[PDB]
Design a protein around this ligand. Structure first.
Ligand SMILES: [Ca+2]
Length: 313
């Protein structure tokens, strides 16, 4: 201001949701109503080997929530919104699990066509990593991280493991690992003091050390594309810090598979750099809800529809 002392603040981060934020009908309002968004949607349609747009808009096969489909659907919706927005001037970005790929497209690490192929393979490898019934995930609500981690250490036994996977906000920690231990937690969660332990609709033990089984296949595929440096820092899920290096970001995308999503620490790191406005771009406002529980003073904007794009523009 007029004192010549500009407070740390006024930085803005654009952020992107992942699995769990999809909805049938997503992006149907953009298609053929905005040229930039439609370029992205038609790119995804021409690139993918299934009918991504039918799957997003009407999902007559009820497969939108199967992660091999949901991942490219979410990337496509967030990127289509992003392409339609004018003078979005982010200082940083982050995204939740799949959402980090939307950050990579936003920061020009990856082109949209390279990223949509990459996340389709990421979804197919995750979906096929373990047979039905071997690994799963559950949301533990109402407990501090230290208590959830203790519980996980107690139940991990007999060569089976359960680990904190998605560290979302105070009172919401998703855990992941062998299904027998996930189901024991589901059964005993109330007695252990959790407000609610919700088993989740997932095909495997995502973001647990068990996902090392797909590291090699994923590293091999991602070498088929050119990765670039980021134009502004991507706060990565593995380490909760801003990264711009192409080789550091690429290596962290492979580690991301089998490492917990550090959403609380990434949110905190961004606020400690002076981010006071987060703009969520995608279907739903799930990350805005998590950030509100992390810090109630920062500003939250959600961009979900063509009308929200018009209002911003
Ligand atoms: Ca990854």
């Amino acid at each position: 201001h007029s004192s010549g002392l500009v407070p740390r603040g006024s930085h803005m981060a654009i952020i992107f949701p992942g699995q769990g934020a999809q909805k049938v009908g997503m992006a149907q309002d953009l298609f053929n109503n905005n040229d930039q968004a439609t370029e992205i949607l038609t790119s995804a349609a021409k690139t993918l080997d299934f009918d991504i747009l039918e799957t997003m808009f009407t999902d007559e096969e009820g497969k939108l929530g199967e992660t091999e489909n949901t991942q490219p659907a979410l990337l496509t919706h967030s990127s289509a919104l992003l392409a339609a927005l004018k003078n979005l001037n982010p200082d940083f970005t982050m995204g939740h699990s799949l959402g980090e790929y939307s950050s990579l497209v936003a920061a020009d690490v990856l082109s949209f066509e390279d990223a949509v192929k990459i996340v389709r393979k990421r979804g197919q490898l995750m979906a096929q990593a373990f047979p039905t019934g071997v690994g799963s995930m559950a949301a533990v609500l109402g407990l501090d991280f230290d208590k959830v981690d203790e519980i996980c250490k107690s139940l991990s036994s007999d060569d089976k493991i359960i680990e904190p996977a998605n560290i979302n906000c105070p009172g919401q920690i998703v855990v992941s690992g062998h299904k027998a231990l996930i189901d024991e937690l589901v059964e005993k969660g109330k007695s252990l003091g959790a407000k609610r332990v919700m088993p989740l609709a997932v095909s495997g033990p995502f973001h647990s050390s068990l996902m090392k089984v797909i590291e090699e296949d994923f590293s091999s595929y991602i070498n088929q594309f050119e990765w670039r440096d980021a134009k502004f820092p991507v706060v990565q899920n593995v380490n909760a810090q801003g990264e711009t290096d192409k080789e550091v970001i690429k290596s962290n995308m492979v580690k991301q598979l089998y490492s917990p999503v550090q959403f609380i620490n990434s949110t905190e790191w961004l606020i400690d750099q002076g981010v006071d406005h987060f703009i969520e771009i995608g279907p739903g406002k799930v990350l805005s809800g998590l950030i509100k529980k992390i810090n109630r003073d920062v500003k939250l904007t959600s961009i979900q529809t063509l009308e929200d794009v018009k209002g911003w523009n």
